[PDB]
Amino acid sequence: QMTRQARRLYVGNIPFGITEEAMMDFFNAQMRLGGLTQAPGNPVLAVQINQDKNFAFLEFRSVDETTQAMAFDGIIFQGQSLKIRRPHDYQPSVYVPGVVSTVVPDSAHKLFIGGLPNYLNDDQVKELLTSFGPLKAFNLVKDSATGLSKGYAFCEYVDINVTDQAIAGLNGMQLGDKKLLVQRASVGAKN
Template structure:
């Protein structure tokens, strides 16, 4: 077989795998496909038809033992993977072989039902997972928006699994687009409409190309009211969080500093400046107070904002971040105690 024929043979044995979630490894994907092919008897019980895989950020390629086995593996299209994600299995764009005969999807092959709102058409499924973010400002970066909105979804219990539910963010001038990991979480994220961020209220809605059924959802004010009243609880939480009983313009941060960080006066000033710069992103930051070593409240940081909404935005944006290996705790702090410099 000459080099051209070898190249064509490999292309005929390869399949494109779309919608792979973050963290998918090549070995895991190979084992998963081999097990699936054995389960539905598309290969012999002891066969290992998948020889190789290459994983990128959102898609992968698998190489089968033969072109015939690649034809059979097309029936894995729609197979549920990590977290219920439906994998898209198809020919790669460089495939120039004969047209494939009609083949079943995974759901047709196994008798499983397609989850509500799921699509085997990759483009339609992606549109269901995308949202338009309007009213952005020039200083808002893709990572800032992804972290802030993802944190907000997790903090008020709208995320349906662990980790940030937002896969990607694309910023373009005065608007952006975010892509969530599932269509259901995209529908939940519509409740972030009007959430305050960096002095503006973000608009969250469907993109213009969305043609699905109308959504029924609230705005950020509605979700926040339910969260603060305890009506909306975090997943698996038996009670509302302690700070849900009241709001404040002051935020208390724990686990950001160690006693050693407060020993050097120059390092103390650097920490003060860095904190002011980072935390000003959430709104009108009036004061930053960091008790020195030996004082009441040492190793904690206190932030005073112009409004309770801005303080809440800071809590959603900062809580859970890691700092020198420590997970940051962010809660409301009593305004009267802050004014009296009582940090107990």
């Protein structure tokens, strides 16, 4: 697809109070400094922010740079894991070092992390988990009305063998006034 639906992306979980200019500068810097542009200049042309729902739509100058920007899904910016997705009406990439996807599919070793203090942000929870090993995917569940944490997260380690090590280390750990519950997410998932 070459139309505008192929040149825009949904970005959720954006930092509180960020401006459209700051969002544009961030993505332009990440793309240029990552060597991910297809031509001189800035790939991001426009940003439309919905403050009430803390999401933005980015518009890019080209289809290929839009596709490349999908690889930033999960990048940390002012404490937040940016959730990057296609527009739902899009008609259907180089890996970016260090970026951890926010797409956490149900799987054998997907973990549930419960009991997190609600004031911890995505970066802080991710740092807690990454002490055991690098993550393949991670998402801290946010309230659909404030963008504030609901106190639990899901993740998957690159090395499936780290799963049991993280359970052993973190399950039952005191954190603030809470006690963590760490187990494979299949165990406690709804019916």
